[PDB]
């Protein structure tokens, strides 16, 4: 039907236009969010050089556990919010099998709305408003507070985020988060001078806001590029669909004109 094909052509043309505009907007957002990753990757990575020079391994005997999945609120990114949830619930059962009680936290409405079905009681707290504005240290500092004002005596932790590598590809990654009783008991920390169990607490509480901030910068410059790619693919698919539907529309309009001609001619020749 000609009206059906016209409706569908108009619909998919609107879709293609909006998707191209969205791709260019996500490209404008990614160019910035990747310029602000170079100063936040020296800070964040310079915040974990100790735990690698001191070579903190972490205790495998403690049971309580924390698991941070970093994502955003907005979809249309692809496997961004799916790779995080894929990694979380993959190792939630891995630690639950060994008796290690795991309790989750969700940064971003997408990572919560996914795992809210299966693991909903194993969920300490969740957050919002991640993704609209570029993540700042004010956001990472807040998330660190309620991770301490929660009464969860977590003995080991890992934060899962999307490590950005290039515009084409990113990888999911988890960074370890050590508590006090493992960084104060490690016999490789005996060389560090003027250390008591309080100046380590202030140092473990700050290094929780860093590894969250370094995570929010990596998982937002890896999400805008993925949104750019996904909107590019969506606009391209809409374009090929528009091409096919325009071919079909031309065929149908020609058929309609010919049918009307044949009707008029058969009516005229029957007199």
């Amino acid at each position: 039907t000609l009206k059906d094909i016209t409706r569908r052509l108009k619909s998919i043309k609107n879709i293609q236009k909006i998707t191209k505009s969205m791709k260019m907007v996500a490209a404008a957002k990614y160019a910035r969010a990747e310029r602000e990753l170079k100063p936040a990757r020296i800070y964040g990575l310079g915040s974990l050089a100790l735990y690698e020079k001191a070579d903190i391994k972490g205790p495998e005997d403690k049971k309580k556990h924390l698991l941070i999945g970093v994502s955003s609120d907005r979809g249309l990114c692809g496997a961004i919010h799916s790779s995080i949830a894929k990694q979380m619930k993959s190792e939630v059962a891995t630690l639950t099998a060994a008796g290690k009680e795991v309790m989750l936290v969700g940064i971003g409405d997408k990572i919560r709305g996914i795992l809210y079905r299966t693991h909903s009681d194993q969920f300490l707290v969740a957050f919002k408003e991640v993704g609209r504005k570029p993540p700042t240290f004010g956001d990472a500092s807040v998330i660190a507070l309620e991770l301490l004002n929660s009464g969860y005596e977590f003995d080991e932790g890992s934060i899962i985020f999307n490590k950005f590598r290039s515009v084409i590809s990113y990888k999911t990654e988890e960074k370890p988060i050590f508590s006090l009783n493992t960084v104060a008991s490690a016999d490789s920390m005996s060389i560090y001078d003027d250390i008591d169990a309080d100046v380590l607490q202030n140092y473990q509480e700050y290094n929780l806001a860093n590894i969250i901030y370094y995570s929010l910068k990596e998982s937002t410059t890896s999400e805008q590029s993925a949104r750019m790619t996904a909107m590019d693919n969506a606009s391209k698919n809409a374009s090929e669909m528009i091409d096919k539907l325009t071919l079909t529309f031309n065929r149908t309009r020609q058929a309609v004109i010919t049918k009307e001609l044949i009707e008029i001619i058969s009516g005229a020749a029957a007199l």
């Binding site: 236009k17 909006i18 191209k20 505009s21 969205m22 260019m24 907007v25 957002k29």
Partner: protein
């Protein structure tokens, strides 16, 4: 001809970049300037019914529009600005309108006079 060449180019570029509307708060300053000039120009083309303007008044309005003397106003007042500016020029500057009507072209004298009038009205406009 002089003024509408520029108007046509500006409106063509605005039609090129008009699909990115509703996303102007997240685009670079070039696309935003294009969108702004184009919106102001489309607001300049709106016209009442049964009110046809003379040629000198049309070219004065399009001059005030395309030269950049309207990016400071947000679109919802462009119509009132155009109406009040028209009233002021017709009731005050009949001499410049007469010279443009007789010559048919915009001299450099008339260009500077129009710049002066438009800037002073922008100063005095509500």
């Amino acid at each position: 001809k002089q003024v509408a060449g520029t108007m046509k180019l500006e409106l063509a570029q605005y039609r090129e970049v008009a699909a990115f509307a509703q996303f102007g708060s997240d685009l670079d300053a070039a696309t935003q300037q294009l969108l702004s000039r184009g919106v102001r120009l489309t607001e300049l083309l709106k016209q009442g019914q049964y009110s046809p303007m003379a040629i000198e008044e049309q070219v004065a309005v399009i001059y005030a529009g395309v030269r950049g003397y309207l990016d400071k106003l947000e679109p919802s007042k462009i119509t009132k600005f155009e109406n009040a500016f028209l009233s002021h020029v017709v009731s005050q500057h009949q001499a410049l309108l007469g010279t443009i009507r007789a010559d048919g072209k915009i001299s450099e004298q008339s260009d500077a006079k129009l710049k002066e009038i438009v800037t002073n009205f922008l100063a005095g406009f509500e």
